[PDB]
């Protein structure tokens, strides 16, 4: 006779009763209290259901940040449906791929800034374009607009018994290979994530969070959109980051938190200097020194532990930053320890647990593990093999029990019989105090496929030779993993997106012979 | 392909890897680190499985507090079995009832203080006594002892795929009628409860909790045994409360928390005064003023909100104190608002939602709701009707959205066509500033079954008449709910257990004619 666990719908139904006059969401001139939000969600759900959307059905969002993203997630959630929050910077080929892959019943799109890509993509789909398209930033009466579609639904709550293990949020992720896959996050995934984040950040109903991170990425949901929603705080939306509008919203909405990277913080600070505008309610998590005393430094566990400075490990498929230095105290390893909804093992290629200090694939079980990728039957079977989710990230356990994240398992060398993970070698070299960064590649060898080569970037105030790098590796890693040679560079090549460009390293330094 | 949620077994498996040298449990001379505890749990699980215990099977604990209670819960949990932590003060009739009801495969019992009751109870069971009995506080080699049974198991983890919705902890509760029923708490119930409690109390791996509350009751598990376990802190066991031993453990184990009622606090303080023993690490939640500066006042949300002083509502069946003033800010209602794993509605007799201010039965859905009572098919069907758990507690929602707990729904008057809940009338009278407490009973009326009568206890420094009590009620409650007469008393009659004695009020004041 026992009932379901809590769903995202239950959260809104509770907030509308417990917090009748509190502001849930702000987006430009739109201000919605909990009951006004839940009413809109019910009307939206009514219209979605009238259009044939039910359990397991799919809605794709192709816009920037909006309060409507939260409405759509809640409304789909009340029907047991799911929303993909798409990457609004997709070019037409990638947008077409995602539309065909996800196969949505409904697409909610944005005109501003992306109408050209959208038009190109619909042209490409041709006779396969059978979804309903609704323009979110339309005139309010536009019959092909979101608001008109929503207004046509009734106030009644659908009141269905939705299983919270159902996917509700789908976020596309890219492998190093460039292959993209939609990670299925359930109600339970999001609630467990949000509950842990509320402990990490000391979040409560007085939190006012600026949704200045992209909602197509897990970061903004974890820190701090979903915990703010869960604890009945106020979510303030900005479409994307424009420093002046951000500053204005921080002040006008009295924000306590925001998702801001250091270059944005510096921009905000420069334009606020000697204006007298009060940013002191903002709890500075990232780059506290950059704020020049204008914000208050965060004293939550998130900041105190170093997690805010990157001391942790996670991925979309673990509902975000699931391992951190805020769990379990001081840590020799760079990532800390798993939080409450997760257990982690480091597994070798044979699926056996690695010894302390031995590098292997980070694998996980627990409430924060995603439900799999959408439409990836073979990949899912492989990646959930033996009842563990395989992250494709390489790590090790330290003697104190903490974890170190080394890099990906998807780069591998094979030198004669020996599999070698460059990430392990890179991390070893990067411990040398003269080294700022190191990239490891494989170069062809006619007798045993590949030799190991390191491309090393020194700190400006340091010097070290090829031989000294090689000897540094001797006591730390297996002999066959050491670089045969070392090239020095001023900096590594990087992609337009800021990631390491291994194709470029391979082209420059004679890389080849990979498995 | 997606996996299970987190189980209690996963918690111990993670802690043994992440916290290899930290102390998990202390009980007299026993000190167990996380790996030593998980090893014992694996040996215990091996022996339990060898004896035929598997999914859905049942172990009854008839002892006082022990580290072995945590071991048994974990070991049963790894098999998908459940442990009833019995009321060690049961007299033989109640002990026999519980044994026959719960029908355990194994009974782990305690000689000290209760051997006579146990012997009487086994005599009564006669030829129906077919369970294995293991003495927990035996000589270590006793072949009918717990330690010998455990030592015979192997170190291998059973490594089963246990559904965490499975009951793992069973706690007996008593209705006002005196009927006793075992509430089924799942792994998920306990973990969700523990996660919320860790936010409430700011619990982490440095917490050191003294298990000085009874483990047969939900209080000690919620505040703070289970969150301490979840966050990898140290649980220190005391068999029962003896002020001097408690004081010694608080100091020697450097406890940060304990489950202590005010009379016990005052006893500890009296015996610590001018000894110089340092109690300053203890975070005083209850009765902070009674500590005379010897402990540090708790600054967590639990204390700051008033929850620690009783501003909240819960029951075993909601995994404890599930509604509190720490959730959602200031509250007009005495109980506050529901925490994250719960939604609450106040429902009238017809199952429709009550208006703001109208008294009705507190009903719940969500992750913290129990799985039902053991062996109560008809009661469970009735109490989970319409997909809500019915608490049998009477409450109302206030205009600000908070909740007030009024009393039980199991006391009811029926005066002609009108159902009247005395708890509603009592709460109304108790708002009068002259009134310390009020009890309401029904007295026979030959024309319409019952009239309402109030028994009122005044504050010592106040005076108020019968008529003034009646007129106080006029604008606050329906006319037919007002007392027809008021008797004044120096204090209410109470049972040996400290609860109100309505049988005694009925006998003294002419009560009768109940539905
Ligand atoms: C602003 C960011 C982050 C938020 C999401 C984006 C999409 C946005 O425009 O709203 C984003 C834009 C990025 O080009 C940028 C800009 C700058 C700072 C962070 C991000 C950096 C490091 O060069 C990357
Ligand atoms: C987004 C995180 C978490 C998940 C895994 C990552 C790889 C990712 O990009 O998906 C990750 C990236 C981290 O730089 C970051 C960014 C921000 C917020 C969380 C994480 C914080 C605190 O500075 C750490
Ligand atoms: C915006 C992201 C994600 C999408 C693809 C990228 C390439 C991009 O610029 O569009 C990417 C850029 C990343 O520096 C960033 C920026 C910020 C937020 C997410 C990503 C974070 C966590 O620091 C990582
Ligand atoms: C100590 C308590 C609470 C813990 C569990 C008990 C069983 C125990 O002995 O360990 C318990 C004993 C109760 O008679 C008592 C004693 C005193 C203070 C609280 C409890 C009060 C109010 O008169 C009730
Ligand atoms: C045990 C609680 C919670 C559940 C429902 C109750 C009725 C019960 O006895 O079962 C409840 C009793 C409360 O006096 C108490 C006791 C202690 C700890 C929690 C609750 C605290 C903080 O002083 C509040
Ligand atoms: C010990 C309890 C529970 C069992 C039955 C009782 C009668 C008893 O004395 O044995 C009971 C006594 C309650 O005052 C108490 C004491 C403490 C802890 C639980 C119960 C709490 C929460 O303050 C309520
Ligand atoms: Cl739902
Ligand atoms: Cl398990």
PDB file of N, CA, C and O in Angstrom, chain A residues 2-3 5-6 14 17-20 165 195 199 202-205 231 301 328-329 337-338 343-345 353 366-367 371 387 400-401, chain B residues 2-3 5-6 14 17-20 165 195 199 202-205 231 301 328-329 337-338 343-345 353 366-367 371 387 400-401:
ATOM      1  N   UNK A   2       2.104   1.226   0.285  1.00  0.00           N
ATOM      2  CA  UNK A   2       2.960   2.412   0.422  1.00  0.00           C
ATOM      3  C   UNK A   2       3.076   3.203  -0.891  1.00  0.00           C
ATOM      4  O   UNK A   2       2.934   2.636  -1.979  1.00  0.00           O
ATOM      5  N   UNK A   3       3.326   4.510  -0.791  1.00  0.00           N
ATOM      6  CA  UNK A   3       3.196   5.391  -1.967  1.00  0.00           C
ATOM      7  C   UNK A   3       4.535   5.712  -2.623  1.00  0.00           C
ATOM      8  O   UNK A   3       5.611   5.223  -2.219  1.00  0.00           O
ATOM      9  N   UNK A   5       7.721   8.044  -3.904  1.00  0.00           N
ATOM     10  CA  UNK A   5       8.590   9.030  -3.414  1.00  0.00           C
ATOM     11  C   UNK A   5       8.130  10.378  -3.934  1.00  0.00           C
ATOM     12  O   UNK A   5       7.255  10.490  -4.791  1.00  0.00           O
ATOM     13  N   UNK A   6       8.771  11.395  -3.442  1.00  0.00           N
ATOM     14  CA  UNK A   6       8.530  12.778  -3.856  1.00  0.00           C
ATOM     15  C   UNK A   6       8.926  13.059  -5.330  1.00  0.00           C
ATOM     16  O   UNK A   6       9.980  12.659  -5.785  1.00  0.00           O
ATOM     17  N   UNK A  14       3.339  21.514  -2.656  1.00  0.00           N
ATOM     18  CA  UNK A  14       3.643  21.858  -1.272  1.00  0.00           C
ATOM     19  C   UNK A  14       3.961  23.338  -1.136  1.00  0.00           C
ATOM     20  O   UNK A  14       3.384  24.009  -0.255  1.00  0.00           O
ATOM     21  N   UNK A  17       1.021  25.769  -1.041  1.00  0.00           N
ATOM     22  CA  UNK A  17       0.306  25.758   0.252  1.00  0.00           C
ATOM     23  C   UNK A  17       1.114  26.353   1.388  1.00  0.00           C
ATOM     24  O   UNK A  17       0.563  27.108   2.209  1.00  0.00           O
ATOM     25  N   UNK A  18       2.410  26.051   1.457  1.00  0.00           N
ATOM     26  CA  UNK A  18       3.225  26.489   2.555  1.00  0.00           C
ATOM     27  C   UNK A  18       3.739  27.903   2.384  1.00  0.00           C
ATOM     28  O   UNK A  18       4.056  28.537   3.379  1.00  0.00           O
ATOM     29  N   UNK A  19       3.886  28.381   1.150  1.00  0.00           N
ATOM     30  CA  UNK A  19       4.457  29.681   0.894  1.00  0.00           C
ATOM     31  C   UNK A  19       3.582  30.527  -0.013  1.00  0.00           C
ATOM     32  O   UNK A  19       4.027  30.989  -1.064  1.00  0.00           O
ATOM     33  N   UNK A  20       2.344  30.788   0.404  1.00  0.00           N
ATOM     34  CA  UNK A  20       1.411  31.418  -0.533  1.00  0.00           C
ATOM     35  C   UNK A  20       1.807  32.793  -1.075  1.00  0.00           C
ATOM     36  O   UNK A  20       1.443  33.139  -2.216  1.00  0.00           O
ATOM     37  N   UNK A 165      11.336   8.049 -10.553  1.00  0.00           N
ATOM     38  CA  UNK A 165      12.462   7.501 -11.323  1.00  0.00           C
ATOM     39  C   UNK A 165      12.364   7.816 -12.821  1.00  0.00           C
ATOM     40  O   UNK A 165      13.322   7.602 -13.566  1.00  0.00           O
ATOM     41  N   UNK A 195      19.081  18.267  -2.513  1.00  0.00           N
ATOM     42  CA  UNK A 195      19.158  18.097  -1.106  1.00  0.00           C
ATOM     43  C   UNK A 195      20.608  18.159  -0.616  1.00  0.00           C
ATOM     44  O   UNK A 195      20.917  18.834   0.374  1.00  0.00           O
ATOM     45  N   UNK A 199      22.688  21.310   1.777  1.00  0.00           N
ATOM     46  CA  UNK A 199      23.670  21.156   2.849  1.00  0.00           C
ATOM     47  C   UNK A 199      25.003  21.828   2.499  1.00  0.00           C
ATOM     48  O   UNK A 199      25.599  22.536   3.329  1.00  0.00           O
ATOM     49  N   UNK A 202      24.351  25.729   2.391  1.00  0.00           N
ATOM     50  CA  UNK A 202      23.485  26.330   3.415  1.00  0.00           C
ATOM     51  C   UNK A 202      22.334  27.125   2.744  1.00  0.00           C
ATOM     52  O   UNK A 202      22.117  28.322   2.980  1.00  0.00           O
ATOM     53  N   UNK A 203      21.587  26.435   1.889  1.00  0.00           N
ATOM     54  CA  UNK A 203      20.513  27.037   1.119  1.00  0.00           C
ATOM     55  C   UNK A 203      19.203  26.924   1.881  1.00  0.00           C
ATOM     56  O   UNK A 203      18.938  25.912   2.545  1.00  0.00           O
ATOM     57  N   UNK A 204      18.374  27.956   1.798  1.00  0.00           N
ATOM     58  CA  UNK A 204      17.067  27.903   2.429  1.00  0.00           C
ATOM     59  C   UNK A 204      16.065  28.800   1.703  1.00  0.00           C
ATOM     60  O   UNK A 204      16.331  29.288   0.622  1.00  0.00           O
ATOM     61  N   UNK A 205      14.893  29.031   2.291  1.00  0.00           N
ATOM     62  CA  UNK A 205      13.867  29.799   1.608  1.00  0.00           C
ATOM     63  C   UNK A 205      14.229  31.277   1.389  1.00  0.00           C
ATOM     64  O   UNK A 205      13.499  31.953   0.678  1.00  0.00           O
ATOM     65  N   UNK A 231      14.021  24.433  -1.746  1.00  0.00           N
ATOM     66  CA  UNK A 231      13.878  25.097  -0.430  1.00  0.00           C
ATOM     67  C   UNK A 231      12.949  26.318  -0.445  1.00  0.00           C
ATOM     68  O   UNK A 231      12.776  26.991   0.559  1.00  0.00           O
ATOM     69  N   UNK A 301      30.086  25.431   3.614  1.00  0.00           N
ATOM     70  CA  UNK A 301      30.995  24.318   3.350  1.00  0.00           C
ATOM     71  C   UNK A 301      31.509  24.283   1.927  1.00  0.00           C
ATOM     72  O   UNK A 301      32.660  23.897   1.682  1.00  0.00           O
ATOM     73  N   UNK A 328      33.711  14.765   4.219  1.00  0.00           N
ATOM     74  CA  UNK A 328      34.674  13.911   4.865  1.00  0.00           C
ATOM     75  C   UNK A 328      35.977  14.505   5.296  1.00  0.00           C
ATOM     76  O   UNK A 328      36.823  13.774   5.733  1.00  0.00           O
ATOM     77  N   UNK A 329      36.126  15.826   5.231  1.00  0.00           N
ATOM     78  CA  UNK A 329      37.248  16.495   5.860  1.00  0.00           C
ATOM     79  C   UNK A 329      38.451  16.590   4.925  1.00  0.00           C
ATOM     80  O   UNK A 329      38.298  16.437   3.717  1.00  0.00           O
ATOM     81  N   UNK A 337      35.725  13.225  -1.382  1.00  0.00           N
ATOM     82  CA  UNK A 337      35.016  11.995  -1.167  1.00  0.00           C
ATOM     83  C   UNK A 337      33.569  12.115  -1.663  1.00  0.00           C
ATOM     84  O   UNK A 337      33.039  13.225  -1.834  1.00  0.00           O
ATOM     85  N   UNK A 338      32.928  10.984  -1.888  1.00  0.00           N
ATOM     86  CA  UNK A 338      31.581  11.050  -2.366  1.00  0.00           C
ATOM     87  C   UNK A 338      30.602  11.586  -1.340  1.00  0.00           C
ATOM     88  O   UNK A 338      30.758  11.356  -0.147  1.00  0.00           O
ATOM     89  N   UNK A 343      28.117   5.878  -4.097  1.00  0.00           N
ATOM     90  CA  UNK A 343      29.289   5.132  -3.690  1.00  0.00           C
ATOM     91  C   UNK A 343      30.152   4.959  -4.947  1.00  0.00           C
ATOM     92  O   UNK A 343      29.607   4.830  -6.075  1.00  0.00           O
ATOM     93  N   UNK A 344      31.464   4.988  -4.755  1.00  0.00           N
ATOM     94  CA  UNK A 344      32.421   5.020  -5.864  1.00  0.00           C
ATOM     95  C   UNK A 344      33.413   3.906  -5.723  1.00  0.00           C
ATOM     96  O   UNK A 344      33.930   3.688  -4.632  1.00  0.00           O
ATOM     97  N   UNK A 345      33.684   3.216  -6.837  1.00  0.00           N
ATOM     98  CA  UNK A 345      34.817   2.306  -6.875  1.00  0.00           C
ATOM     99  C   UNK A 345      35.676   2.612  -8.079  1.00  0.00           C
ATOM    100  O   UNK A 345      35.168   3.063  -9.117  1.00  0.00           O
ATOM    101  N   UNK A 353      38.306  -4.291  -8.565  1.00  0.00           N
ATOM    102  CA  UNK A 353      38.620  -3.083  -7.821  1.00  0.00           C
ATOM    103  C   UNK A 353      40.117  -2.831  -7.734  1.00  0.00           C
ATOM    104  O   UNK A 353      40.875  -3.723  -7.365  1.00  0.00           O
ATOM    105  N   UNK A 366      24.195   4.551  -6.932  1.00  0.00           N
ATOM    106  CA  UNK A 366      23.534   5.370  -5.938  1.00  0.00           C
ATOM    107  C   UNK A 366      22.456   6.242  -6.553  1.00  0.00           C
ATOM    108  O   UNK A 366      22.238   6.258  -7.763  1.00  0.00           O
ATOM    109  N   UNK A 367      21.790   6.963  -5.678  1.00  0.00           N
ATOM    110  CA  UNK A 367      20.625   7.765  -6.037  1.00  0.00           C
ATOM    111  C   UNK A 367      20.920   8.877  -7.030  1.00  0.00           C
ATOM    112  O   UNK A 367      20.062   9.204  -7.821  1.00  0.00           O
ATOM    113  N   UNK A 371      19.716   7.934 -15.331  1.00  0.00           N
ATOM    114  CA  UNK A 371      18.953   6.762 -15.761  1.00  0.00           C
ATOM    115  C   UNK A 371      19.544   6.178 -17.053  1.00  0.00           C
ATOM    116  O   UNK A 371      19.004   5.240 -17.561  1.00  0.00           O
ATOM    117  N   UNK A 387      26.365  -3.672 -12.963  1.00  0.00           N
ATOM    118  CA  UNK A 387      25.607  -2.880 -11.994  1.00  0.00           C
ATOM    119  C   UNK A 387      26.340  -1.670 -11.447  1.00  0.00           C
ATOM    120  O   UNK A 387      25.984  -1.147 -10.386  1.00  0.00           O
ATOM    121  N   UNK A 400      44.521   7.840   2.459  1.00  0.00           N
ATOM    122  CA  UNK A 400      43.548   8.380   3.405  1.00  0.00           C
ATOM    123  C   UNK A 400      42.068   8.110   3.032  1.00  0.00           C
ATOM    124  O   UNK A 400      41.179   8.463   3.782  1.00  0.00           O
ATOM    125  N   UNK A 401      41.827   7.499   1.891  1.00  0.00           N
ATOM    126  CA  UNK A 401      40.491   7.160   1.449  1.00  0.00           C
ATOM    127  C   UNK A 401      39.873   8.142   0.473  1.00  0.00           C
ATOM    128  O   UNK A 401      38.871   7.823  -0.125  1.00  0.00           O
TER     129      UNK A 401
ATOM    130  N   UNK B   2      19.250   1.352 -15.613  1.00  0.00           N
ATOM    131  CA  UNK B   2      19.595   2.165 -14.439  1.00  0.00           C
ATOM    132  C   UNK B   2      19.478   1.374 -13.126  1.00  0.00           C
ATOM    133  O   UNK B   2      18.705   0.415 -13.038  1.00  0.00           O
ATOM    134  N   UNK B   3      20.250   1.767 -12.111  1.00  0.00           N
ATOM    135  CA  UNK B   3      20.400   0.921 -10.912  1.00  0.00           C
ATOM    136  C   UNK B   3      19.528   1.377  -9.747  1.00  0.00           C
ATOM    137  O   UNK B   3      18.736   2.337  -9.841  1.00  0.00           O
ATOM    138  N   UNK B   5      18.627   2.848  -5.971  1.00  0.00           N
ATOM    139  CA  UNK B   5      18.985   3.905  -5.122  1.00  0.00           C
ATOM    140  C   UNK B   5      19.935   3.373  -4.067  1.00  0.00           C
ATOM    141  O   UNK B   5      20.156   2.171  -3.924  1.00  0.00           O
ATOM    142  N   UNK B   6      20.452   4.281  -3.295  1.00  0.00           N
ATOM    143  CA  UNK B   6      21.342   3.978  -2.174  1.00  0.00           C
ATOM    144  C   UNK B   6      20.644   3.197  -1.027  1.00  0.00           C
ATOM    145  O   UNK B   6      19.547   3.524  -0.620  1.00  0.00           O
ATOM    146  N   UNK B  14      30.829   2.394   1.317  1.00  0.00           N
ATOM    147  CA  UNK B  14      31.486   3.652   0.984  1.00  0.00           C
ATOM    148  C   UNK B  14      32.350   4.137   2.136  1.00  0.00           C
ATOM    149  O   UNK B  14      33.532   4.474   1.916  1.00  0.00           O
ATOM    150  N   UNK B  17      35.778   2.518   2.574  1.00  0.00           N
ATOM    151  CA  UNK B  17      36.765   2.984   1.579  1.00  0.00           C
ATOM    152  C   UNK B  17      37.183   4.428   1.780  1.00  0.00           C
ATOM    153  O   UNK B  17      38.379   4.747   1.664  1.00  0.00           O
ATOM    154  N   UNK B  18      36.237   5.312   2.094  1.00  0.00           N
ATOM    155  CA  UNK B  18      36.527   6.714   2.202  1.00  0.00           C
ATOM    156  C   UNK B  18      37.093   7.099   3.553  1.00  0.00           C
ATOM    157  O   UNK B  18      37.767   8.115   3.639  1.00  0.00           O
ATOM    158  N   UNK B  19      36.783   6.350   4.608  1.00  0.00           N
ATOM    159  CA  UNK B  19      37.202   6.697   5.945  1.00  0.00           C
ATOM    160  C   UNK B  19      37.893   5.544   6.651  1.00  0.00           C
ATOM    161  O   UNK B  19      37.475   5.127   7.731  1.00  0.00           O
ATOM    162  N   UNK B  20      38.990   5.049   6.081  1.00  0.00           N
ATOM    163  CA  UNK B  20      39.558   3.811   6.619  1.00  0.00           C
ATOM    164  C   UNK B  20      40.006   3.841   8.081  1.00  0.00           C
ATOM    165  O   UNK B  20      39.953   2.801   8.768  1.00  0.00           O
ATOM    166  N   UNK B 165      13.547   0.404  -0.922  1.00  0.00           N
ATOM    167  CA  UNK B 165      12.169   0.532  -0.427  1.00  0.00           C
ATOM    168  C   UNK B 165      11.779  -0.594   0.538  1.00  0.00           C
ATOM    169  O   UNK B 165      10.736  -0.523   1.190  1.00  0.00           O
ATOM    170  N   UNK B 195      19.315  12.680   5.791  1.00  0.00           N
ATOM    171  CA  UNK B 195      19.774  13.742   4.969  1.00  0.00           C
ATOM    172  C   UNK B 195      19.166  15.082   5.397  1.00  0.00           C
ATOM    173  O   UNK B 195      19.870  16.092   5.513  1.00  0.00           O
ATOM    174  N   UNK B 199      21.091  18.597   7.376  1.00  0.00           N
ATOM    175  CA  UNK B 199      20.873  20.023   7.139  1.00  0.00           C
ATOM    176  C   UNK B 199      20.374  20.739   8.399  1.00  0.00           C
ATOM    177  O   UNK B 199      20.858  21.830   8.749  1.00  0.00           O
ATOM    178  N   UNK B 202      23.333  20.677  11.025  1.00  0.00           N
ATOM    179  CA  UNK B 202      24.704  20.917  10.553  1.00  0.00           C
ATOM    180  C   UNK B 202      25.629  19.746  10.977  1.00  0.00           C
ATOM    181  O   UNK B 202      26.666  19.913  11.636  1.00  0.00           O
ATOM    182  N   UNK B 203      25.235  18.539  10.587  1.00  0.00           N
ATOM    183  CA  UNK B 203      25.942  17.325  10.956  1.00  0.00           C
ATOM    184  C   UNK B 203      26.984  16.990   9.900  1.00  0.00           C
ATOM    185  O   UNK B 203      26.755  17.181   8.697  1.00  0.00           O
ATOM    186  N   UNK B 204      28.134  16.494  10.335  1.00  0.00           N
ATOM    187  CA  UNK B 204      29.157  16.073   9.393  1.00  0.00           C
ATOM    188  C   UNK B 204      30.037  14.973   9.986  1.00  0.00           C
ATOM    189  O   UNK B 204      29.730  14.417  11.023  1.00  0.00           O
ATOM    190  N   UNK B 205      31.151  14.645   9.334  1.00  0.00           N
ATOM    191  CA  UNK B 205      31.978  13.546   9.801  1.00  0.00           C
ATOM    192  C   UNK B 205      32.657  13.801  11.156  1.00  0.00           C
ATOM    193  O   UNK B 205      33.233  12.870  11.699  1.00  0.00           O
ATOM    194  N   UNK B 231      26.810  10.567   7.681  1.00  0.00           N
ATOM    195  CA  UNK B 231      27.920  11.512   7.421  1.00  0.00           C
ATOM    196  C   UNK B 231      29.287  11.021   7.914  1.00  0.00           C
ATOM    197  O   UNK B 231      30.283  11.719   7.809  1.00  0.00           O
ATOM    198  N   UNK B 301      20.247  25.386  12.695  1.00  0.00           N
ATOM    199  CA  UNK B 301      18.842  25.673  12.416  1.00  0.00           C
ATOM    200  C   UNK B 301      17.886  24.971  13.357  1.00  0.00           C
ATOM    201  O   UNK B 301      16.832  25.519  13.708  1.00  0.00           O
ATOM    202  N   UNK B 328      11.194  27.016   6.163  1.00  0.00           N
ATOM    203  CA  UNK B 328      10.331  28.036   5.626  1.00  0.00           C
ATOM    204  C   UNK B 328      10.141  29.295   6.411  1.00  0.00           C
ATOM    205  O   UNK B 328       9.338  30.097   6.021  1.00  0.00           O
ATOM    206  N   UNK B 329      10.909  29.502   7.478  1.00  0.00           N
ATOM    207  CA  UNK B 329      10.965  30.793   8.134  1.00  0.00           C
ATOM    208  C   UNK B 329       9.899  30.926   9.219  1.00  0.00           C
ATOM    209  O   UNK B 329       9.356  29.921   9.667  1.00  0.00           O
ATOM    210  N   UNK B 337       6.495  24.086   8.833  1.00  0.00           N
ATOM    211  CA  UNK B 337       6.188  23.624   7.508  1.00  0.00           C
ATOM    212  C   UNK B 337       6.913  22.304   7.218  1.00  0.00           C
ATOM    213  O   UNK B 337       7.898  21.953   7.886  1.00  0.00           O
ATOM    214  N   UNK B 338       6.437  21.578   6.224  1.00  0.00           N
ATOM    215  CA  UNK B 338       7.076  20.331   5.929  1.00  0.00           C
ATOM    216  C   UNK B 338       8.472  20.489   5.357  1.00  0.00           C
ATOM    217  O   UNK B 338       8.750  21.440   4.637  1.00  0.00           O
ATOM    218  N   UNK B 343       4.914  16.137   1.516  1.00  0.00           N
ATOM    219  CA  UNK B 343       3.891  17.134   1.274  1.00  0.00           C
ATOM    220  C   UNK B 343       2.708  16.772   2.180  1.00  0.00           C
ATOM    221  O   UNK B 343       2.450  15.565   2.432  1.00  0.00           O
ATOM    222  N   UNK B 344       2.028  17.795   2.679  1.00  0.00           N
ATOM    223  CA  UNK B 344       0.990  17.629   3.699  1.00  0.00           C
ATOM    224  C   UNK B 344      -0.287  18.268   3.247  1.00  0.00           C
ATOM    225  O   UNK B 344      -0.261  19.388   2.748  1.00  0.00           O
ATOM    226  N   UNK B 345      -1.402  17.554   3.440  1.00  0.00           N
ATOM    227  CA  UNK B 345      -2.705  18.180   3.291  1.00  0.00           C
ATOM    228  C   UNK B 345      -3.543  17.910   4.519  1.00  0.00           C
ATOM    229  O   UNK B 345      -3.394  16.862   5.165  1.00  0.00           O
ATOM    230  N   UNK B 353      -9.956  18.513   0.873  1.00  0.00           N
ATOM    231  CA  UNK B 353      -9.007  19.410   1.509  1.00  0.00           C
ATOM    232  C   UNK B 353      -9.694  20.507   2.308  1.00  0.00           C
ATOM    233  O   UNK B 353     -10.582  21.181   1.796  1.00  0.00           O
ATOM    234  N   UNK B 366       5.117  11.274   0.292  1.00  0.00           N
ATOM    235  CA  UNK B 366       6.498  11.655   0.085  1.00  0.00           C
ATOM    236  C   UNK B 366       7.456  10.582   0.569  1.00  0.00           C
ATOM    237  O   UNK B 366       7.065   9.552   1.113  1.00  0.00           O
ATOM    238  N   UNK B 367       8.723  10.861   0.349  1.00  0.00           N
ATOM    239  CA  UNK B 367       9.798   9.910   0.610  1.00  0.00           C
ATOM    240  C   UNK B 367       9.931   9.510   2.070  1.00  0.00           C
ATOM    241  O   UNK B 367      10.315   8.394   2.343  1.00  0.00           O
ATOM    242  N   UNK B 371       6.365   2.514   5.164  1.00  0.00           N
ATOM    243  CA  UNK B 371       5.845   1.550   4.193  1.00  0.00           C
ATOM    244  C   UNK B 371       4.532   0.931   4.697  1.00  0.00           C
ATOM    245  O   UNK B 371       4.002   0.088   4.036  1.00  0.00           O
ATOM    246  N   UNK B 387      -4.348   7.354  -1.641  1.00  0.00           N
ATOM    247  CA  UNK B 387      -2.938   7.647  -1.898  1.00  0.00           C
ATOM    248  C   UNK B 387      -2.323   8.681  -0.974  1.00  0.00           C
ATOM    249  O   UNK B 387      -1.293   9.280  -1.299  1.00  0.00           O
ATOM    250  N   UNK B 400      -0.679  32.172   6.763  1.00  0.00           N
ATOM    251  CA  UNK B 400       0.680  32.274   6.239  1.00  0.00           C
ATOM    252  C   UNK B 400       1.219  30.976   5.584  1.00  0.00           C
ATOM    253  O   UNK B 400       2.316  30.971   5.062  1.00  0.00           O
ATOM    254  N   UNK B 401       0.450  29.909   5.623  1.00  0.00           N
ATOM    255  CA  UNK B 401       0.826  28.649   5.017  1.00  0.00           C
ATOM    256  C   UNK B 401       1.425  27.634   5.971  1.00  0.00           C
ATOM    257  O   UNK B 401       1.546  26.487   5.607  1.00  0.00           O
TER     258      UNK B 401
END
